[PDB]
């Protein structure tokens, strides 16, 4: 009743507003045919909200959606008599016990991630659940979710979970978040086939045996692990994004079987040759920094690239990088490049990292007027070229790699004094014009 809504309004002193389909950040209500309250949102209503609103809440028996997200509540005992709910938002609160969440026979969506929960037994009788958010908690075991069928989106990530076997009993899921945990065996994740997004981030996984069974995946996050063989991923070609960050891998030939992949982070590994990345013409982002690779020539056939991270690698010749034109970021610092001539055609560049190399002449990078980041620290540069002061940037002598900045550090600057070059771009220009005069 609108009388109940007004009662809640003056009790909280907050202007609840007649609104539409409820969201986790909603602070109003939703009506019905004959003006019956069904959905109510209390976003950031204080820590004492639940114990003060339950009498008005139980007064109306038509409520089916409750948003108490980010209210920082500690006790949810009042959430027991409102047996007419369907969706419940309880994000980002100091909730430890979910025992009152037992009588809510009907619930289709439960959001609980930002909490301090440790025991998920009480939600064993919640039959018709379809969405569960339980990330960033202190849980260590998941037995009670086995009885929970009809789940499509599950987020159990950020806990101390080691066994995952009961997830086998759950076969309806679409997105599975299982990360920042202590997991070693993924054998249960075999009978799943409807899964599209899998986030198996930081864990002690080294044998991706059952993922071959999955076929509809489009996003695969597998980073900060101890994996070494990616041949299992060779069969699957449907992933728009597959991230393989810090690991110990030496071969990437199985990746060459993929063709629709878009963004590829391949960082901090022992990969030797990147030739298998010669047929992925649709790559928009490539992150290959911190590896032992020598030749960039096989990468001269990916003209759709837009971001390229090649830093801290053993590349000396940059010439077979002139073919690419639609490039915007180029990080290849901490390498052994010498001349930067075969980059003058990279008209679309907007950020560069050319530091910690053996580069003496900077003059070729002159036509690249689009650069909004250039970083040449720790290089043996002797003379500063005219075009170095023709860029829309300010100059810093700091050790930080900042965008919108021309940066030098630890450089034997002889003709331009280091004090002059650390004064600023205007000082560099006046010094050079005086030298001209």
């Amino acid at each position: 009743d609108l009388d109940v809504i007004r009662q809640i309004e003056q009790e909280l002193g907050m202007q609840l507003e007649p609104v539409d389909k409820l969201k986790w950040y909603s602070k109003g209500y939703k009506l019905d045919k004959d003006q019956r309250v069904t959905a109510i949102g209390l976003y950031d209503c204080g820590s004492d909200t639940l114990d003060r609103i339950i009498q008005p809440l139980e007064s109306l028996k038509s409520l089916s959606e409750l948003s108490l997200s980010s209210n920082q509540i500690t006790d949810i005992s009042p959430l027991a008599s409102l047996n007419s709910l369907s969706m419940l938002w309880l994000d980002r609160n100091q909730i430890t016990d979910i025992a009152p969440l037992a009588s809510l026979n009907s619930l289709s969506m439960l959001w609980l991630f930002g909490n301090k929960i440790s025991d998920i037994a009480p939600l064993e009788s919640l039959k018709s659940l379809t969405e569960l958010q339980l990330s960033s908690n202190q849980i260590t075991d998941i037995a009670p979710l086995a009885s929970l069928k009809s789940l499509t989106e599950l987020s159990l990530s950020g806990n101390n979970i080691s066994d995952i076997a009961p997830l086998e009993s759950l076969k309806s899921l679409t997105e599975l978040s299982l990360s920042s945990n202590q997991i070693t065996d993924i054998a249960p994740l075999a009978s799943l086939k409807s899964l599209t997004e899998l986030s198996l981030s930081s864990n002690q996984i080294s044998d991706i045996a059952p993922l071959e069974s999955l076929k509809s995946l489009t996003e695969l996050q597998l980073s900060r692990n101890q994996i070494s063989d990616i041949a299992p991923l060779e069969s699957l070609k449907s992933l728009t994004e597959l991230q393989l960050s810090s690991n110990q891998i030496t071969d990437i030939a199985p990746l060459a079987s993929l063709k629709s992949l878009t963004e590829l982070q391949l960082s901090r590994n022992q990969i030797s040759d990147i030739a298998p990345l010669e047929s992925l013409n649709s790559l928009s982002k490539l992150w290959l920094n911190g590896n032992q690779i020598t030749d960039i020539a096989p990468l001269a056939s990916l003209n759709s690239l837009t971001e390229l991270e090649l830093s801290s690698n053993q590349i000396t010749d940059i010439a077979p990088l002139a073919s690419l034109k639609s490039l915007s970021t180029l990080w290849l610092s901490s390498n052994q490049i010498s001349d930067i001539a075969p980059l003058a055609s990279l008209e679309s560049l907007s950020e560069l990292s050319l530091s910690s190399n053996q580069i003496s002449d900077i003059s070729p990078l002159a036509s690249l007027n689009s650069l909004t980041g250039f970083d040449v620290r720790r290089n043996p540069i002797k003379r500063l070229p005219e075009t170095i002061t023709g860029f829309d940037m300010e100059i810093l002598w700091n050790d930080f790699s900042s965008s919108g900045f021309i940066t030098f550090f630890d450089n034997p600057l002889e003709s331009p004094p280091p004090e002059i070059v650390k004064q600023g771009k205007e000082a560099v220009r006046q010094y050079f014009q005086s030298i001209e005069e």
Epitope: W24, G158, S177, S199, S201
Partner: nanobody
């Protein structure tokens, strides 16, 4: 990830507008704001804003820096005016939210140098 645009060398009393855009991967942003690192110091909050419209200021840049946010396109803007030379720092972006189903209250940007 959070991408920051801005920064540079500004005369004292000048102004700046640091922009911070969160990628489409970051899903449910509650708190988003700005932090600083001075040389030989520690990280300290500058500004924080929430989806509901609550602003938290550092009590040292009160009435000086302004935080604005767009929730549709998840973007924060720090409009900074009358920059005293104690602000010569590297500014970082802080956010809370979800990437690929995982929630952390502290997602950081790369940082951008502001000098006076």
């Amino acid at each position: 990830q959070l991408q920051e645009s801005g920064g540079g060398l500004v005369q004292p009393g000048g102004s700046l507008r640091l922009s911070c855009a969160a990628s489409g991967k970051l899903l449910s942003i509650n708190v988003m704001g700005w932090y600083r690192q001075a040389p030989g110091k520690q990280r300290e909050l500058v500004a924080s804003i929430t989806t509901g419209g609550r602003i938290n200021y550092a009590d040292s840049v009160k009435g000086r820096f302004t935080i604005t946010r767009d929730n549709a396109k998840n973007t924060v803007y720090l409009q900074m005016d009358s920059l005293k030379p104690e602000d010569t720092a590297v500014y970082y972006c802080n956010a809370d939210g979800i990437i690929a189903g995982l929630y952390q209250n502290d997602h950081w940007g790369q940082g951008t140098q502001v000098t006076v």
